[model samples]
Target chain A: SKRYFVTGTDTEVGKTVASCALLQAAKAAGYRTAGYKPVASGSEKTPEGLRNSDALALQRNSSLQLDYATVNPYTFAEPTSPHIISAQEGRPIESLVMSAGLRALEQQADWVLVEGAGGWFTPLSDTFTFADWVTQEQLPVILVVGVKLGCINHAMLTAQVIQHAGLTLAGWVANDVTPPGKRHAEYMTTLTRMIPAPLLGEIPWLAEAATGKYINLALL
Target chain B: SKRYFVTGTDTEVGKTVASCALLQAAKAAGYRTAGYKPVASGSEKTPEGLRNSDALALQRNSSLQLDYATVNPYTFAEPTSPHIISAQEGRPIESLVMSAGLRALEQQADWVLVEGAGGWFTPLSDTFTFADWVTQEQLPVILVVGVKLGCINHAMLTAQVIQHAGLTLAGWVANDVTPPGKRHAEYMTTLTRMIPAPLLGEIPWLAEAATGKYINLALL
Candidate 1:
């Protein structure tokens, strides 16, 4: 079984969509795939319970049938930073739980993708940030660079920090989530040359879900 | 003579306003003060030259008279991120020039306040960021936290990064730049306990320049 961690440049940067596409590509390549969102804030109070849209989308794409709680161990209702939400709910996220949960999901599939909340440095609680968990686990990272203004700095800084923490940045995917600009192509070219990792895919702006044509499955 | 570098949690977080207040306070305390905007992108082409409103405001508030170029070395006409503006103009910002600019301003005034373009981690050029300049000089920073939703995360992250860079966070100002919310007080309370830096001031909403009573001059 192969495993990877997906993180974004910033919040709402198509991390979930990239994760789903990764799962789809793996499934198409005859691999039983599973997606795990270890912790998610900004969840809706659905009849099924507190469901994050990213988690729901991941659940739909995954070949493995798993309990929602197993996929997303922590869910907060407030649409704010996860640490603030954790403070309000008075529930501290346990690293042990996250480790156990990912292991559970890993047992069920040949390929597992763990998606982080918000950006790479996003805080899980008062004392711990998402990077800490990734460091402890030593999982290879797939950076989701949301193509937008100031994205170059964000992408470069994130890559530097990821490498600084002694983690492997397997590759990066460029998602065209923002309005197209003249500098878009130029920015992509700059990133391709600067970032040490390969450009695994380039997703265009979508009115609906686009297929995984640009997604390179060989990185796994 | 004393020098302070004023940065913000984000752009439009009242760095100019805080710098003005700091200048006014220093002047009131029988010290000559000058404010510097090392690099500004977003300016109107006046008869004299391209002038940033923030730079002009700083010039107006300083006790020491200086040329616009002395206060703001780099000015871009486009209202965009400084790095993008730099790339468009093919002018890379030299950190040595910025350091020299601040030192020149310091030579003329007892207290010099240098304001950054956007946030703490804002990019000055393709190769270097604003924080790198601050780090290179070992300048003690005064963070202006714009009180608003999601500011808790912004302020905290900025503070963490500032400290992680091995620079001292001299203090922070809570500016009521955004519309007041019910959680405003709660956010302030959370920040007071969490941030290792001291609360230098708390600026409330004002139609005009409010007298700087809340700003504690003792820190200087």
Candidate 2:
């Protein structure tokens, strides 16, 4: 059984997109896969309940049929950083709750992917951060580098921090949009050469949606 | 006499702006100030030579006037990461050169501000990084937090790493744009509360330009 925590260089760097692709890739590899988003900040109010777009996407891509509660344990309506929303509501996100959710998900799936919000060091509370929790869990991490102008440093810093924290940097993925400029190609080359781990896949920015084929699950 | 290395959460995060402001503040406080940009990549080709905008800004704000070479030892034409441009040009940035530049500035000024091109971990070449050099020198660091979504995480991670490396995070500043929305105020408040270091200043988005008044150099 292989479980991983997926994080990104920053917010809007395509964590959910990459997680979905990884889940789909895992399912195709014949492993029962599940996507666990222990905490999510933004959501839409629905008759059923507040539905997080990323959590729903992860659930759809997952091989296992699980309830929304199982997929995302904590949900908020504010479309902002998770820590802020938690603080504003005066509800601190407990790592124990997140850990318990992952434990349940791990039992049902051979490969469970727990996606984190924002960057690796996103705080769960004043004294705790997602990185701290992941360190305690000792889960291998997959970084989602949102391709942009200063992505090289972001990707580099994040990977360095992950390894320094004693977590294995399992792999990384490039989440790009509509072939912007020469900088994209140049930056990607730099990432491929610099990052110590394997590049799982490069998602292209095109009209068509990305698929599991765009990801390489062999290393995972 | 004190020398500080100024780095940002990421590139284009107002490292130059904050550095210049600090330099001006130090001058107003009756200290001989000099701003040093050790390595600059983006620049305008001047009649004198390839002049870096940030370096020029720093030099202009400094109480002491020094040669441009002493201000920025490594200059690259490409408007990209210093390492990529250096590598593409077959040049490796040596920490010794950067160290000597700072040493020279320190002799002339009571306070010397050394601005980094990008984030805390920006690499100088394949073998070394700015952080590595700063660590060896054990210069205190000033972080410029670019106000935007997810800044809290970047600010937190950088400060943690700085202290972990045994370098004092002297202080940090909020480089923000024209009061955008509710999010702006909320985010700034979040940064002020979370970051352990004293907030040096908050730069309002001003077209007329920020000056010494906005920055409080008491901490530095």
Candidate 3:
């Protein structure tokens, strides 16, 4: 079973969007897939229950179609940092619980994609970070570089940190949130040269919702 | 003689502001001060020459005024990543040139503050990054943590990278670029605990321009 962890340079750089794309690609390859977000803040209260947009999107795109709790174990209402939200809500997130959830999801599918909240080093609790968990799991990473101003620094620094953590940067995707500018081509060239990983896909800013077909799944 | 390298979590995170503060503090402590910006990409074409705002600020506050070339060896007119500008302009940045510039400034002043371009790992040339220079020089670093939504991840990851590079993270400062919100205190608390270095100062959102007086000089 192959499990990949997806994280970004910053929040809202489309981690869920990339995760959904991963699920779509896995299904296209005829593999049973599961999407797992261990902890998610900024969830919406719905008729059924509290739902995170990222989790719902991942569930909708996943082949296994598991329950919400199985997909995202910890959900917070406030749209802020997870640790602060955890303190306010009084539900501390533990990596042991996250690891167990991931193990269960991995058992149910041929491929399980774990998407992280915020950035790679986003805090899971007061004492630990999500990157620590990724290192512990020894999962290969797929980074999402949000193409924007200051992205080169963000992406390059992240690659160094990922490498320093003794994790493999399997591949990376260039997600263009803003419209491509004159400097975009040059920026891409620099990223290709500077980043240690291969550029798996170059996703353009979508006029409509992402169809998950935007990314090429050949490498994954 | 004391020398410190001023780098930031990201660009516009107040590296120059902090460098100026370091100069002011050093001057107050009865030491001749000098400020150096090894390479600056963003600059304005002035009648005298290309002028970088950060360089000008550093030059204005320093007790010993040196030639612009000695302070900043490479200055690009276009406001973008240095690597891109360097490639386009064909003015490749060499570490030897930067090293010579620093040596000249160090000869002139007892306290010299060297500021990085964008972030710690911002590229100086195609192969070498600013962090490499910091490692080679073994200069103690003063990180400016830009207080914003995704700062915790940026700050912590930067700290780890700084340590892995075999450099000293002497201290760090918190610069409030955004308004103080509900999560500000919590964010500050997390940074204080997570970062291995001591908190040098916490700069408020200033109504006027930075005076460099906000930073505490005792630690420096």
Candidate 4:
């Protein structure tokens, strides 16, 4: 088992939640896991200027101890597109620094769980993005789909774009971020039947939860 | 007094035709006008190099003499966005070079009508757009609204973006670029009622061939 990149249908559709859960599952299976978030925005300032909360969560959850600098290379304050904000601030995000961070993190552990920032297609800079960086990394993609209204189209489109870009769609996780009202069963059943890849797992909306046994990871 | 910057809601939306009409109108109104398309893509390579037909048409309609280089600073063969083509061609579009072209045109003519490539907000470079150029010049805008299915929304949105950037909406032209239908009339009627600027002129579709009589002088 090498590694897998977790991507989402849209921003704030619970990518970090699903990724953390998956890493927790890998740990339960007795595997040493590492996690990384290549770029992030909407960060809070620590003593280290600006830091991403999602990267900190990954560091706390992972079995391997990695430097904060090596996990997330580009972090910004404003919750806008990196390109727009960076250009406004007169400093563009550097991919070379990110490449160095990724290189350092990848050497430390097996079964690495790479978490993406916002949507898969979010621009990290004016000329390049996390999507381009992810493609450059050559990792198999694990889609964390939040099944909601218009989600089937978003899910299918995301999968199509991933395949079109010559990246492998390793598997998909049907993560229920919030309770779907009337069409929940219909969407779940349709997605389970229709999506062309393995259904890695299906996570239900939780009032309260913990641990690994609830997850179905046979697809991995 | 600033020269006109004629821009379209989207690519191939009669920008060349409208600009030509505007140029002819400007000339007829006794203002010595020259045409410029500073950057253009989707061109054919001649013995000299690449050539843009839009630039050629503008050159033809102009009453003033202009060098070919002054007409269009950047011309690319591929039918892609200028930002992408710049990366593929290995020479980025510098704002200074475009500014130089504008300055050259300014020296020669009483009024310079610069035609925009695609939509108002479309990226000309990874860092900047035609919008930024317009902003830099502090020029007023004349939008060419293509009377089509989504023309109203496109026109309204383009106006919104222009105003958002703090530019004045000088006027707009309603070009009947749609097929023979009642929807075109609805768009015109709705847009005329909604937009605050003057209705510059109504351009009938090219097949009907009415170019001479419909040019508006006051707005031009």
Candidate 5:
């Protein structure tokens, strides 16, 4: 079984959608797939308990009949950055728990995807950032470039730090998160040139189904 | 003469405005100040020459009587990322010239501020990024964090990468680029705790006159 950590260049930059697509693609390849995120912020007050939309989507993509608690261990309420949503008022996120959540998913699924909150450096607590935990786990990363005016820089920044942290940037996916402009292709041309990672897929905005998961499942 | 390089968390994150305020603050503190940006993209045609709005603002705040060329050496005429506007379509930016531009300004002003086009890692040419030039110049870097929901992450990412690059994150300024929310003060408290730098200033939205240059120019 292989595990991949999916992170975006910025927040709301389609990390969950890309993870779902990856999960779908992995399932197509005959692997039992699962999606997990240890700490989920900005969750809704659902009757099923505090549920994050990204966590819900992740659970839906899993081939295993899993409980929500197994998929997303920590869920924070409020439309806020994960840390502040609770770092001061609520319980601090421990890397130990985050690690355990992903490990538990690995036991059941042949291929597991971990979706991170916000960008790579998004803080989970006052002491540790998401990157801090990802690094400890030594998980290979997949970047989701949100395709915007300043995406090139954000993509580069995210990838470089991933490298600096000595983590493998396994591949990157271009998510058409914004209404792309004529200069759209130009952004990837630069990104593909600069980043030493494969362009696993180029996803269209609001992709409908497996056809949308045009991701290459080889060499990843 | 002291030199400082001012960069932002993202594009249009008030680097120029903060630079202008810095220049004003320096001048008020009995130092001749000049703002210089070797490469500025997204300029408009004018009678005198190609002018970038940020360049114009930087020039206006110079204590010395300076010409446009001395402030901003390279001005591209499209509202595009500097590289794509030219990196392949037109001329590639040279780091040698960028360094020379900052040196020229240092001769004229006691406190010289160099403004970068986009975020810290924004590319100037295929071979070099803004960070490359800043690192080579060994300039003390000031971060202008454009406050937003994702700012804490952006600010942290930029600062950590700068430190990893072996450059001193001399200071940081909180710019109200977005409408303020009650959680605004919380962002800074986190930043202040995370980034090992002085709080240069907390600038208000569309700051007016010298009152806006509330920078603590002592540590810097």
Candidate 6:
């Protein structure tokens, strides 16, 4: 009877991939699943409309289709920090609309998975973050640690912060996003041994057929 | 009797150098002052034990010979974000322990000039930043902005964030860290227009002797 909010340690830390994988597994495990991509930036144009690759991927992985607007409330056309994008676009992130997006998804399915943009404390407005909305929604959280050079600290720090925000950290996932010059397996092994959280899964970067769209290209 | 919590837009943005200058300014204004380096990440071995150039610089600028330990509460050998380094070194920032150090230094001076580790809202523990600490201490902030690429934006955001956190923005010091690129003057001029705070001073890169010691120490 609870919705799970997905947040990442850093940008491009695979919140979408991990969220999709979780949704896939949730559906595979026989649960009626729905998802939302509340506020997204760095999207591409599709014939259907503005399609955030992250939003599209979530849509494809969903057990049932959700209205594009229902899933993602505010979609920007740039690949920068949402605050910067919002400032340029002159449309700040709206809290009530975000609440409405969640409301739409919640009515459609028994379980909802809300994927946050960028890191937990990322600014969505002049003085707020994706996490601020998470707090406003009063949902549980599942942080995705992008295993790379600085991830261990990013993860620990993130976990500490999510806890501080008065939200339940239901679990965590790790994405193997290490490009080069990082000890991947050893790091995961250390995290598995040290980090006192349930390791939900680890997502590897997909090869071939990695096509998806996001709707935003406002040139600054 | 408000203290000055000195922080920068980013690391290596001449926080320590500017802090030393501010210390000198306060000393010249006939105020009793001391320096506080709450925690340091990058340190080298010295005969006294561990030495952080940033901390040492503040120590040199202090009018009084304060205990080395009174300044830096948490010291890490790695020159990275505190969250990352603390994990590598296996240390959580203990607020009680940190405050004890702060108290000792507070007893020695009428005013405290505390320097933060990195940019705003960087994690000291999993849940705290120097900003958080500054908020807790109820001190006014003196932001040190390095005039370079993205400085205008960073300074604006920093002022906005400080105001958002319900703290006072004492003033800001603009340092010409480098005269690189053509849009330098334009950036500074723009910051004055945009940022809703007073510019305390504009600092050019120092001549050798001026850079050698902070004028604060001489004034004291």
Best candidate according to DockQ: 5
Report lDDT per candidate.
0.80, 0.82, 0.82, 0.72, 0.82, 0.69
Q: Please report, as a residue range, the 10-residue window in candidate 3 chain B with the lowest summed lDDT.
A: B206-215
Error of 2 at B185 (Å): 5.2
Error of 6 at B120 (Å): 9.7
Per-candidate iRMSD: 3.8, 2.3, 1.5, 15.4, 1.5, 7.4
How well is each residue in A106-153 modelled by candidate 5, as lDDT tens digits?
Answer: 788989999887777777777778888989999999988877767777
Can you write out model 4's per-residue Cα lDDT over A1-220, one digit (the tens) per residue?
A: 3778898765535777777788888878777777888777779988867888888877777887767766777677876556556766787777777667666766766678888766565555645756788788788998887776434545655666677668999888877877656556656765565467888777777753353554566677
Off by over 4 Å in 1: A193-196, B81-92, B119-129, B148-161, B182-186, B189-194, B205-208
Q: Sorted on DockQ, highest at the top, how do the candidates line up? A: 5, 3, 2, 1, 6, 4
Query: How much is B72 displaced in model 5, in angstroms?
Result: 1.3
Candidate 3 residue A134 Cα shift, in angstroms, is: 1.9
User: Over 4 Å off in model 6, which ranges?
Assistant: A46-49, A65-70, A80-100, A103-110, A119-136, A146-167, A174-220, B1-21, B24-33, B46-49, B63-110, B116-220
For all candidates in order, state the fraction of native interface contacts they contain.
0.02, 0.46, 0.73, 0.00, 0.68, 0.00
Q: On residues B1-220, what C-alpha lDDT tens digit does candidate 1 reach at each position? A: 6888898765557777788887887878878888889999889998998999999988988888889999899999876668777888899888889989988887888888888886665666667878888899888999887776545655666676777788999998888886777667766876787678889888887643744566898965
Error of 1 at A145 (Å): 2.7
Write one digit per residue (lDDT tens) for candidate 3, span B67-180.
Answer: 777777789988887877898898888888888888888788988888888877677667888888878888999889877768888888788888887788999999887777
| Model 3 pairs whose backbones collide | none
TM-score for each of the candidates:
0.87, 0.92, 0.94, 0.51, 0.94, 0.59
Model 2, which residues run further than 4 Å from truth?
A90-92, A178-180, A183-186, A207-210, B178-180, B183-186, B208-210
Candidate 5's clash total is: 0
TM-score of chain B of each: 0.94, 0.94, 0.94, 0.93, 0.93, 0.88
